[PDB]
Amino acid sequence: AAATSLVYDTCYVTLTERATTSFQRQSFPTLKGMGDRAFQVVAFTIQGVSAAPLMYNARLYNPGDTDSVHATGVQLMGTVPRTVRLTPRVGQNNWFFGNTEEAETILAIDGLVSTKGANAPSNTVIVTGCFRLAPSELQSS
Amino acid sequence: AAATSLVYDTCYVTLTERATTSFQRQSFPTLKGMGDRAFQVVAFTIQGVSAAPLMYNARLYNPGDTDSVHATGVQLMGTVPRTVRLTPRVGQNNWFFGNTEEAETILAIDGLVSTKGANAPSNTVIVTGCFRLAPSELQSS
Amino acid sequence: AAATSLVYDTCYVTLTERATTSFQRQSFPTLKGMGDRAFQVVAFTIQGVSAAPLMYNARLYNPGDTDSVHATGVQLMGTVPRTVRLTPRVGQNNWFFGNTEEAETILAIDGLVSTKGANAPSNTVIVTGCFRLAPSELQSS
Amino acid sequence: AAATSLVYDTCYVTLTERATTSFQRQSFPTLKGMGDRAFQVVAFTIQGVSAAPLMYNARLYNPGDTDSVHATGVQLMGTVPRTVRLTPRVGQNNWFFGNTEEAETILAIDGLVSTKGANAPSNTVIVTGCFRLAPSELQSS
Amino acid sequence: AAATSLVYDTCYVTLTERATTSFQRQSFPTLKGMGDRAFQVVAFTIQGVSAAPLMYNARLYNPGDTDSVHATGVQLMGTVPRTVRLTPRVGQNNWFFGNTEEAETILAIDGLVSTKGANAPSNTVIVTGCFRLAPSELQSS
Amino acid sequence: AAATSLVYDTCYVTLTERATTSFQRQSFPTLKGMGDRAFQVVAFTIQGVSAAPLMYNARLYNPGDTDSVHATGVQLMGTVPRTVRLTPRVGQNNWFFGNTEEAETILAIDGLVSTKGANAPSNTVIVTGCFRLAPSELQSS
Amino acid sequence: AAATSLVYDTCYVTLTERATTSFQRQSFPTLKGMGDRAFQVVAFTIQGVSAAPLMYNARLYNPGDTDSVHATGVQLMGTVPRTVRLTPRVGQNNWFFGNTEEAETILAIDGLVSTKGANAPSNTVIVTGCFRLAPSELQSS
Amino acid sequence: AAATSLVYDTCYVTLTERATTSFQRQSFPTLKGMGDRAFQVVAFTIQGVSAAPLMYNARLYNPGDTDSVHATGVQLMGTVPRTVRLTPRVGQNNWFFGNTEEAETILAIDGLVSTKGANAPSNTVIVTGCFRLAPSELQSS
């Protein structure tokens, strides 16, 4: 098969009170490492855990798009860890090119708390990304 | 059968903020006791529990290896206890000899917290090891 | 059938930092009440709950034995209650006689915390015992 | 399973004219090594060989028993090696504790020759023991 | 089979008003005869007959036990003979050694009459014992 | 069943050049012990072993018989042990009474060597006897 | 699954008259890029083409091995392209670590011509490597 | 098939009282002959015979290992010849290279006698080795 190399990477972070957190090409070790490659993503590992009531939403972004077209949906947490997977279907699948941009926004998560202007309980969310990579350009003498 | 003696031992510990914790030959009562024997391990009992959001990864090490080749994978906790088993397959199975070294690193667990430079909530993880032992050299007059 | 009377009793307690807790003949209302009877135990109801990470082990003791021969095994807790049953099989079944001893140690639980010299979170464990009793000696005129 | 560690050890010796030979806790490397542990035995490997007519009997001893209750039975030898296995059934199974006694007699073999006061031909008998061990007491902080 | 010799013996006696009657090693011809042997019992033949209303209870005793753990149960009689068999199951089966004690109490029967301080009608009870014997130690030159 | 007690005993000895060896009531521990009992035998365990070429024949004797009527048959030995069983059928079964005779000849073995007037190589033969015993006369007040 | 990222890379080269050509960690774009990672290889794509009669042999090397233990076997070419795959089986599978060595020899190909000291016809061979990679160490705060 | 040449060789020797006997690359004609080749072994032919009681144990050694990880197990002999085969399974299979070392220890046998400091009866043991050989490096012009 003319099948290419496939990849899996994980990342972990803390949410915040009034902000969205961006996972860029550079947030994923393997992808960020090369700095000049074409990649695409198919599915996601998302595990969450909150010390106290807290919500999150992982908006996925398509290449060259002003705004996101897909929603993980608002989630809660609690002690027990909660896992949600987000997989795009044909058409929400366009290719990303982070070779020309030092900074690009793939996927990100806005946080959220019900009580107005109140700080988010200590919590940790870990998201793992499954990427498909186009062949490393073999150097052509 | 020329089958040898098999063994099971348990151990419990607390994680830390910026550190990896090593379980050496001496961390397991039965194994550590003899001080001069050849052993091998097949499977593991790993139970975890955190008072608040906390992560762990149990890297397994092969004999005479500079770096580990296998990953339990990043985990979360929460109140409820979480159990993960790590079993090596052929080739990740080499034999250990702690007879010549007072200190040897079998398996260990790095801890981890999402929030930069923040201390790990009180938590306890207990790992149980299933070891296979070569016959006690019968003294030969 | 020459079947005798069978009994069921429950008891609840708190663990401690550096200590084992003994459940004696007198810890069980029905058994302790008579003060002069022969009893035997077959199975156990053990429910646990910890406010924060904490471990326990219920060692079972056989009659006229210096040391215990069976292990419930190290356990964790968390909010959700955890239940473990310990049932002895032939040979771990010998009869107890608390008639001649004011104090006798049937079963007990050592507590345990991972962090060196740290106090146990508030927690409550309840153990229920299923006992078999020999006939009340009918008074013989 | 709450299954414990199981063990296998071998030992070899020469018989004598008017004497019984005792295999104590210390006769078995693994068992003798710890010096403070509870063990039990289930089955035995017994191979024999005599340069000339000679008999043996392996009496098995139960814990805290003045005299043995089971008999391998008188055996002969000859060149060809002869193997007999002795396995106790429920009730002949009590647990041994060699932790408090430096010297304890588990199993032993009296030798025997038909001709009055005549020395035993050169011969070697090897007995292998299959032991079940209770968990190494995990140190409890 | 390494099967040993098995034995059957019978004995007969009269009950009494305020007393228990003990059947010791010496109460059974075959067993009492040797005076230095290890025996065990499996089942019993117990036939009774009373000239007038009278009760009996055959308590069975285990080796090295302060008190009995099993009860034939209170019985009546009448003219017709009544037979009851008492067979111990695993655990109520321990071995007896009457070699070191001139007097040892195996099984016994307390008598009993309903009417306070009244004498027992003339009556005869016969109990037969089925014993298992360990091999006669073959003299070892 | 009105079934009586059955018994099993073993004995070992050395053969000789020009002689027959007699196993009398007193040669069997259990039987010899009582000194006043009626017994009968059904089958035999006969194991042999010779350091060098040697023959044996176990003639069985019936009660009150001048001469034996049955023949084990001439046997050889060699290193490997050889076992032969001799079981009498109806009519070769008469009962023995050693109560009135201090010395009585049950079964015996003549030895034998091919070379005229030459001594028998060192060798040991062990014969085990299976006896049926009539009830111990219960003492009759 | 705890399945890791897998990779595929291709490379092309010219053979020589009296020499072996080494493909090191740095010969494969993806692998060479990171410069500090653990990888393993399972199967190979090897296509060859010679302008005139020429032979090649791809010896595979195991980690920390003085000499190669496996042989693609001598091959010929001709115009038509010839493809051979080399896949190691358990035991020829050890892991490679090129993190500590700038230069390491994975696999290589010696060339070969039948005619003594004659130059190799112009020819091109392309080998593609299928590698398995251990997770990128997630940075642990 | 790219199948290589396989080999079979035999060797015979005498044991000793207090010593282990080493079979090195040079102990096997075919293997020793080349002096510069890579070989591996799969199974063994081991026949033994002792004039009098004697024991042996064939410990197998893996490449670049301080100590052996597998045990043939203690054996007896006697006149009749006894044969035991030792075959390593994946992981106990590493390759040997005796090309760089004049002397290397593959497999060896310690002898053994039950009676303290007593000499071993005359005896002969013959071991046959089944080896797998990597291709003879075809000279490459």
- Pull the structure tokens for residue D13: 């010796």
- Chain B residues contacting G via beta carbons under 8 Å: 18, 57, 62, 65-67, 69-74, 90-91, 110-117
Say how far apart CA H135 and CA H141 lie, in whole Å: 17
Measure the CA angle with vertex F6, ends F2 and F11; round to 5°: 165
Asked whether F and C share 3 or more beta-carbon pairs under 8 angstroms, the answer is no
G4, A6: Cβ pair inside 8 Å? no
Say how far apart CA G54 and CA F4 lie, in whole Å: 96
F12, D112: Cβ pair inside 8 Å? yes
**Among chain H residues, CA nearest to B139:** H112
- Pull the structure tokens for residue D52: 């000339």
- Tell the residue number behind the tokens 């705060």, with chain if given: G141
Q: Which of D52, D76, D82 sits opposite F126 (nearest CB)?
A: D76
Q: Is the dihedral of CA H119, H120, H122, H125 positive or negative?
A: negative
Say how far apart CA C32 and CA C37 lie, in whole Å: 9
Task: List the H55-60 sheet strands across, edge first.
Answer: H20-24, H105-112, H55-60, H70-71
Three-state secondary structure along chain F?
A: CCCCCEEEEEEEECCCCCCEEEEEHHHCHHHHHHCCCEEEEEEEEEEEEECCCCEEEEEECCCCCCCCCEECCCECCCCCCEEECCCCCCCCCCCEECCCCCCCEEEEEEEECCCCCCCCCCEEEEEEEEEEECCCCCCCC
**Among chain H residues, CA nearest to D82:** H76
Say how far apart CA C102 and CA C8 lie, in whole Å: 21
- Chain D residues contacting B via beta carbons under 8 Å: 3-12, 28-30, 33-34, 135-139
Domains, chain H: 1-141 (2.60.120.220)
Three-state secondary structure along chain G?
A: CCCCCEEEEEEEECCCCCCEEEEEHHHCHHHHHHCCCEEEEEEEEEEEEECCCCEEEEEECCCCCCCCCEECCCECCCCCCEEECCCCCCCCCCCEECCCCCCCEEEEEEEECCCCCCCCCCEEEEEEEEEEECCCCCCCC
b/e sequence B39-63, b meaning 16+ C-beta within 10 Å: bbbeebbbbbbbbbbbbbbbbbbbe
Name every chain B residue with its beta carbon within 8 A of the beta carbon of H65. Answer: 95
F9, E136: Cβ pair inside 8 Å? yes
The H or E element spanning position H16 is none
Say how far apart CA E29 and CA F133 lie, in whole Å: 13
- φ and ψ at D106, to 5 degrees? -80, -80
Say how far apart CA F52 and CA A124 lie, in whole Å: 85
Q: How far is CA F103 from CA A54, B45, F28, F99, in A?
A: 100, 71, 13, 10
- Measured in angstroms, the CA of H26 and the nearest CA of chain B are apart by 27
Length of chain D: 141
Question: For E35, left (φ over 0), alpha (ψ -120 to 50), or beta?
Answer: left
DSSP state string for chain B: -----EEEEEEEE---SS-EEEEEGGGSHHHHHHSS-EEEEEEEEEEEEESSS-EEEEEE--TT-SS--EE---B---SS-EEE-----TTS---EE-SS-S--EEEEEEEE-SSTT-PPPSEEEEEEEEEEEPPP-----
Tell me which method was used to determine the 3D structure.
X-ray
Q: How far is CA A40 from CA A6, A72, H33, in A?
A: 10, 18, 58
- φ and ψ at E33, to 5 degrees? -55, -55
Q: Which of H74, H14, H63 is nearest to H40 (CA)?
A: H63
G8, A7: Cβ pair inside 8 Å? no
- Pull the structure tokens for residue D14: 């020469």
- Tell the residue number behind the tokens 């939403």, with chain if given: A57
Say how far apart CA H31 and CA G104 lie, in whole Å: 30
Sequence-distant (≥ 6) Cβ neighbours of residue B54 within 8 angstroms: A124, B15, B76, B77, B111, B112, B113, B120, B121, B123
Q: How far is CA E47 from CA B60, F140, G21, in A?
A: 71, 17, 100
CB-based contact G134:B70 (threshold 8 Å):
yes
Q: Which of B10, B12, B80 sits opposite C78 (nearest CB)?
A: B80
- Measured in angstroms, the CA of G141 and the nearest CA of chain H are apart by 37
Q: Which of G71, G23, G114 is nearest to H140 (CA)?
A: G114
Interface test with D, best of E36, E40, E138 (most D CBs within 10 A): E138
D73, E2: Cβ pair inside 8 Å? yes
Local structure of D13: helix, strand or coil? strand
- Chain F residues contacting E via beta carbons under 8 Å: 3-12, 28-30, 33-34, 135-139
Asked whether E and C share 3 or more beta-carbon pairs under 8 angstroms, the answer is yes
Asked whether G and F share 3 or more beta-carbon pairs under 8 angstroms, the answer is no
A 10 A CB-CB count for E122 gives 12
Name every chain G residue with its beta carbon within 8 A of the beta carbon of H100. Answer: 66
**Among chain G residues, CA nearest to H63:** G65
Say how far apart CA F121 and CA F51 lie, in whole Å: 6
b/e sequence B106-134, b meaning 16+ C-beta within 10 Å: bbbbbbbbbeeeeebbbbbbbbbbbbbbb
Chains B & C: contacts with CB separation below 8 Å? 49
Say how far apart CA D6 and CA B30 lie, in whole Å: 12
Q: Is the dihedral of CA D24, D26, D28, D30 positive or negative?
A: positive
Q: Is the dihedral of CA A10, A11, A17, A18 positive or negative?
A: negative
**Among chain A residues, CA nearest to B81:** A80
Q: Where are the alpha helices (DSSP H) in chain H?
A: 29-34
- Pull the structure tokens for residue E51: 């000239």
Say how far apart CA C121 and CA C48 lie, in whole Å: 13
- Chain E residues contacting F via beta carbons under 8 Å: 3-12, 29-30, 33-34, 135-139
Say how far apart CA D124 and CA D122 lie, in whole Å: 7
b/e sequence E69-82, b meaning 16+ C-beta within 10 Å: bbbbeebebeeeee
A8, G3: Cβ pair inside 8 Å? yes
Say how far apart CA C113 and CA C122 lie, in whole Å: 12
**Among chain H residues, CA nearest to G114:** H141
Say how far apart CA C49 and CA C57 lie, in whole Å: 13
Q: How far is CA H127 from CA B1, B42, G28, H43, H82, in A?
A: 21, 32, 47, 11, 11
CB-based contact F58:F46 (threshold 8 Å):
yes
Interface test with F, best of E30, E37, E45, E131 (most F CBs within 10 A): E30
Three-state secondary structure along chain E?
A: CCCCCEEEEEEEECCCCCCEEEEEHHHCHHHHHHCCCEEEEEEEEEEEEECCCCEEEEEECCCCCCCCCEECCCECCCCCCEEECCCCCCCCCCCEECCCCCCCEEEEEEEECCCCCCCCCCEEEEEEEEEEECCCCCCCC
Classify strands G20-24 and G38-50 as parallel, antiparallel or unpaired.
unpaired
Q: Which of G18, G69, G113 sits opposite H95 (nearest CB)?
A: G69
Interface test with C, best of D34, D92, D95, D101 (most C CBs within 10 A): D95
Which class for A101: exposed (0-12), middle (13-18), buried (19 or more C-beta within 10 A)? exposed
E18, C100: Cβ pair inside 8 Å? no
In angstroms, what is the resolution?
Answer: 4.6
Radius of gyration of chain B (CA): 16
